[PDB]
């Protein structure tokens, strides 16, 4: 699949 | 940010993981909210139950 990780603060 | 799974939670913590469905909806989920296990989504094409 197409994955990701969003980095907040 | 909220993703489009049936029983989703909005985490908004430091770093949270997402998966894209390759079964047609191409929408993003959080691995935990759509019952993905990291190994599965990083290994095989991930197709949510809605596209299944
Ligand atoms: Zn889908
Ligand atoms: Zn979600």
């Amino acid at each position: 699949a197409r994955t990701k990780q969003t980095a907040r603060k | 940010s909220v993703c489009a799974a049936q029983n989703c939670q909005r985490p908004c913590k430091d770093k949270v993981d997402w998966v894209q469905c390759d079964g047609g909806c191409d929408e993003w989920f959080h691995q935990v909210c759509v019952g993905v296990s990291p190994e599965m989504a990083e290994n095989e094409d991930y197709i949510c139950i809605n596209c299944a």
Side-chain angles (χ1 to χ4, degrees):
Chain A
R2 291 163 286 163
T3 53
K4 58 187 292 180
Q5 186 179 91
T6 56
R8 295 291 299 173
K9 303 299 178 180
Chain B
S1 304
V2 185
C3 90
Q6 305 180 91
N7 187 89
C8 173
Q9 298 186 270
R10 187 180 189 157
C12 298
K13 288 182 287 289
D14 293 89
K15 290 172 290 294
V16 298
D17 303 276
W18 305 61
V19 201
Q20 194 164 29
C21 191
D22 302 285
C25 69
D26 288 79
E27 290 176 74
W28 291 96
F29 318 111
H30 298 93
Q31 313 221 331
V32 299
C33 59
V34 69
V36 170
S37 303
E39 307 182 275
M40 294 301 303
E42 297 177 281
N43 271 271
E44 294 297 294
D45 311 87
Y46 182 58
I47 296 171
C48 79
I49 63 79
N50 299 87
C51 297

